[PDB]
Amino acid sequence: VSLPRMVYPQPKVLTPCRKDVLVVTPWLAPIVWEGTFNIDILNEQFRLQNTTIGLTVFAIKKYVAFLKLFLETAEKHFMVGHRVHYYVFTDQPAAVPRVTLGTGRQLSVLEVRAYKRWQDVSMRRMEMISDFCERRFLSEVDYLVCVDVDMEFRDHVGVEILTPLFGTLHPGFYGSSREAFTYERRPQSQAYIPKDEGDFYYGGAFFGGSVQEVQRLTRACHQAMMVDQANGIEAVWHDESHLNKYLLRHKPTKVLSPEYLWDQQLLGWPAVLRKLRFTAV
Numbered sequence: 353v354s355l356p357r358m359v360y361p362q363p364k365v366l367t368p369c370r371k372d373v374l375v376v377t378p379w380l381a382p383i384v385w386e387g388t389f390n391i392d393i394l395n396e397q398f399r400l401q402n403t404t405i406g407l408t409v410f411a412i413k414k415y416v417a418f419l420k421l422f423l424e425t426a427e428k429h430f431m432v433g434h435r436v437h438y439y440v441f442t443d444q445p446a447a448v449p450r451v452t453l454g455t456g457r458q459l460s461v462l463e464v465r466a467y468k469r470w471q472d473v474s475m476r477r478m479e480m481i482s483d484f485c486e487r488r489f490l491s492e493v494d495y496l497v498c499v500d501v502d503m504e505f506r507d508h509v510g511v512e513i514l515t516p517l518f519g520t521l522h523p524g525f526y527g528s529s530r531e532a533f534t535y536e537r538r539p540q541s542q543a544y545i546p547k548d549e550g551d552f553y554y555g556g557a558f559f560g561g562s563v564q565e566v567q568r569l570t571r572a573c574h575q576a577m578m579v580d581q582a583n584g585i586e587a588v589w590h591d592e593s594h595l596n597k598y599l600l601r602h603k604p605t606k607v608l609s610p611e612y613l614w615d616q617q618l619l620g621w622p623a624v625l626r627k628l629r630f631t632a633v
């Protein structure tokens with residue numbers, strides 16, 4: 353489908369968008385910062401495909417308390433103007449708040465078991481996401497965005513993130529050397545990465561992609577976790593450790609800056625962050 357005529361500022365070849373940060377990876381994946389994209393062009397591209405975005409969130413046991421603000425703020429900031437399908441995974445279907453949705457946006461509640469240990473609640477998201485890719489997501493959305501629930505949207509999160517596979521730079525480590533990254537360092541674990549390997553430390557709280565690529569990632573991580581379990585070992589940062597191993601070996605096609613995953617209480621508001629889009633409560 354052809355784009356219509358649009359009037360916007362000419363991109364200048366001899367003026368970089370950002371002089372302060374890396375905006376492309378060494379494997380030529382964009383790193384998404386404010387100033388790198390014209391959202392008007394991207395909106396047109398994705399609307400012409402009638403794109404549908406799925407957003408998964410787990411609200412198990414006491415984490416149902418976070419849904420109201422998560423969902424209300426998503427309505428303000430997440431893919432506004434596009435088709436969105438929220439998928440709320442919960443052990444308490446009656447506890448999901450009744451949030452008023454904009455046109456072209458729907459919510460489905462998916463009842464799942466609650467594990468006793470929070471580590472397992474966190475980890476088993478991979479199995480559950482993969483199982484639901486297997487039928488539901490394949491037919492209903494084009495992309496899946498998988499996030500933590502104890503968060504709020506404060507600024508635009510849109511189609512600029514969409515790509516076959518993305519990860520997000522963890523806010524605690526975007527300035528760190530790879531030696532300092534908290535990857536799993538025990539060779540006995542499937543998540544093992546040595547001190548001399550690694551591109552970035554990706555956050556387990558924000559990843560996604562096409563349904564096919566997310567199904568692959570989540571299936572791979574769940575299987576790695578099952579091998580670790582049979583061997584009596586649990587990765588240092590659980591699902592996030594396996595995510596990082598996956599993304600080292602299967603490079604993402606975009607990387608999101610820490611604009612997309614932030615904690616203002618712990619880290620302030622650095623000058624390199626022009627927007628805080630999705631933040632810890």
Ligand SMILES: CCCCCCCCO[C@@H]1O[C@H](CO)[C@H](O)[C@H](O)[C@H]1O[C@@H]1O[C@@H](C)[C@@H](O)[C@@H](O)[C@@H]1O
Pocket residue numbers: 522523524525534555556589592614615618632
């Ligand atoms: C020298 C650097 C010193 C600075 C360290 C700041 C980042 C620490 O971050 C924790 O990082 C862990 C991995 O190593 C896990 O991803 C954990 O979930 C995360 O805490 C989460 O995310 C955080 C951002 C906070 O919201 C915290 O409350 C969460 O539990």
Ligand SMILES: C[C@@H](N)C(=O)NC[C@H]1O[C@@H](n2ccc(=O)[nH]c2=O)[C@H](O)[C@@H]1O
Pocket residue numbers: 409410411412413414415416470473474499500501502557
């Ligand atoms: C680090 C921070 N986002 C966190 O506390 N947990 C990761 C997520 O896993 C899910 N979780 C975890 C423990 C729990 O008892 N319930 C739950 O839904 C929530 O979606 C959480 O956001």
